[PDB]
Amino acid sequence: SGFRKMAFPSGKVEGCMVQVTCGTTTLNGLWLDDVVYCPRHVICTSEDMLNPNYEDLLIRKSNHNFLVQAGNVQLRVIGHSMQNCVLKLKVDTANPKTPKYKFVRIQPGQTFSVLACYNGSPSGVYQCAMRHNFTIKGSFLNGSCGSVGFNIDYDCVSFCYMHHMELPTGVHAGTDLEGNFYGPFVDRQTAQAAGTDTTITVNVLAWLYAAVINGDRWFLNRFTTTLNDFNLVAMKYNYEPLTQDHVDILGPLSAQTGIAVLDMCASLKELLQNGMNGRTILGSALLEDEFTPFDVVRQCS
Amino acid sequence: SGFRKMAFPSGKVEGCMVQVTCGTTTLNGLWLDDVVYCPRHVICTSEDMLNPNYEDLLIRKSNHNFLVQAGNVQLRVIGHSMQNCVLKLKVDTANPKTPKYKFVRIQPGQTFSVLACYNGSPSGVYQCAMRHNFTIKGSFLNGSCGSVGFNIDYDCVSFCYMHHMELPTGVHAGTDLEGNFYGPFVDRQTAQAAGTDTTITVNVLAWLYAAVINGDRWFLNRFTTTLNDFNLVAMKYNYEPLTQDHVDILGPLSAQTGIAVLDMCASLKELLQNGMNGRTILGSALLEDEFTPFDVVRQCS
Ligand SMILES: *C(=N)c1nn(-c2ccc(C(F)(F)F)c(F)c2)c(=O)n(CC(=O)c2ccccn2)c1=O
Numbered sequence A, B: 001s002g003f004r005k006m007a008f009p010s011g012k013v014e015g016c017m018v019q020v021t022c023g024t025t026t027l028n029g030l031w032l033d034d035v036v037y038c039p040r041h042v043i044c045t046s047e048d049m050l051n052p053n054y055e056d057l058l059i060r061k062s063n064h065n066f067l068v069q070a071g072n073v074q075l076r077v078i079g080h081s082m083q084n085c086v087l088k089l090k091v092d093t094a095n096p097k098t099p100k101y102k103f104v105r106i107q108p109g110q111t112f113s114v115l116a117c118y119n120g121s122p123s124g125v126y127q128c129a130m131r132h133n134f135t136i137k138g139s140f141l142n143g144s145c146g147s148v149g150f151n152i153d154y155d156c157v158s159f160c161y162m163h164h165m166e167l168p169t170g171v172h173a174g175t176d177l178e179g180n181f182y183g184p185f186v187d188r189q190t191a192q193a194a195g196t197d198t199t200i201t202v203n204v205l206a207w208l209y210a211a212v213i214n215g216d217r218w219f220l221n222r223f224t225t226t227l228n229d230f231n232l233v234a235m236k237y238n239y240e241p242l243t244q245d246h247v248d249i250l251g252p253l254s255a256q257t258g259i260a261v262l263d264m265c266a267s268l269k270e271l272l273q274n275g276m277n278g279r280t281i282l283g284s285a286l287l288e289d290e291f292t293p294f295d296v297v298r299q300c301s
């Protein structure tokens, strides 16, 4: 029994985190084979940050300005390169600890583990979700840039996220490992608008299912509803619209609980309309939208 | 910015988790040097579980009944031993991956990371807290026994917890690594009472401080209070009494926020008495008691 926000085991990623310094700027990098990856705003400086010309700044740069360190070992930069907003520092030594990996760009609503790092030293691991505004609410202090997000699918590490910046709003933005931001964001010290964050309806329903499997079964209504009717209740409460693909993903959880998706959506409606009246579900007085249906099955089975 | 429940990086513990099987019973063990540690109820069977005589069951046991496997390697049990509720299976091969470690019995209110394992394979990591009833609310499916809780203090792994059982109540009980249960609990399939779980007042105050550092500053009252007066409000709401040792631990967080401990305790009182009125703090509509003052500093600085 039990349901907690759970991150993937982080050992395979710890061995990959190096330090990268440039001028008065130290951040984290990711070392896979002979390439270190890190955010390219490591070559910036104060007066550059408003609208840096990264092409020009990179031309002025000498490998010697690239201080790559793994543990107390210092690595040897044998060249540089810019792929979108990511810098690829090629090196002589290949990482002996390089796991089977791949780069994936994830979709709004998917979750990942974050290994928060400082100075190339792992500090802690926690679970995040890519919101529909392509932000992540995170825990990133100063020096945290270059920390990565990942899933462990089989034995394969699927890197999906590299942290770049905290928006003046207090939420976090970053890129995939090919250097393309999630969202409209650019690596410039300018005010940037994140969109409206809609609640991930399919994640909330997966959680209610986790609740039923862990005992909490008070929210159940014995009513019913239809897609169109629930979705009307969804735009009212800034909930992502539900699709039949969503219903289809929830099916295995439906078969285990004996609870049909539409019957659950009907339970959701009343919590949106009436509320929780001080009751709680899986320890929370709020509806949680950061477990995917896959997360819930991973734990609850 | 940001504050999330964060576990320690788990790599140093992953290398230590083996499989242990006995009869139709498979669970996890912890391999440090030439000793594997695991819960002793691995030698039980169905009819034994109501009141097992572990001495007698262990005498009937032959190393051959102890199937220890790390990865696809199968290890060689060269003897057995019972230390309280823990079984020590000595082996020929010492673990090359054994970190600097120590065994610590933690106090109610302290936190630790749990590496949830199945069949000797790490599945995920999350943060727990030892409650005053010496339970932990966890996420332990079947086969999860032998999973360990730990802190990373310096480079040293401090193992504090080994999971043994889920109480008919839905919460979890276990031992330290010398095999002494936390709490009044025994490894018998009998109904066992956990005590009243009092909220960890010093943890709640550490969180409110984390809130102030992350922007949330609405709960602040501009009132004040005294120990004796707040503690009266604490027994009313089943909150652990506050001591001057508690005030002393909160001091560094006091100096960073410019907020005095008693002024914060006064803010707490009004949230206990009036409530949150639908507002929220660090994302929650509930008061969170599973960050220690040390956890909060670790992240918020
Ligand atoms: C992470 N390592 C980190 N990154 N920045 C930073 C600097 C410049 C840009 C640019 F140019 F816009 F792309 C960024 F996106 C991100 C950074 O400033 N800090 C320090 C920081 O967060 C901070 C905030 C307020 C006051 C002091 N420091 C980083 O740690």
Ligand SMILES: *C(=N)c1nn(-c2ccc(C(F)(F)F)c(F)c2)c(=O)n(CC(=O)c2ccccn2)c1=O
Residues within 6 Å of the ligand: B026, B027, B028, B041, B044, B048, B049, B050, B052, B141, B142, B143, B144, B145, B146, B164, B165, B166, B186, B187, B188, B189, B190
């Ligand atoms: C963990 N590996 C695990 N442990 N038990 C278990 C068995 C016996 C005792 C004893 F004898 F009381 F000490 C225990 F404390 C714990 C266990 O039963 N399961 C399976 C389980 O949790 C379960 C519950 C309900 C229905 C089916 N299975 C374990 O996984």
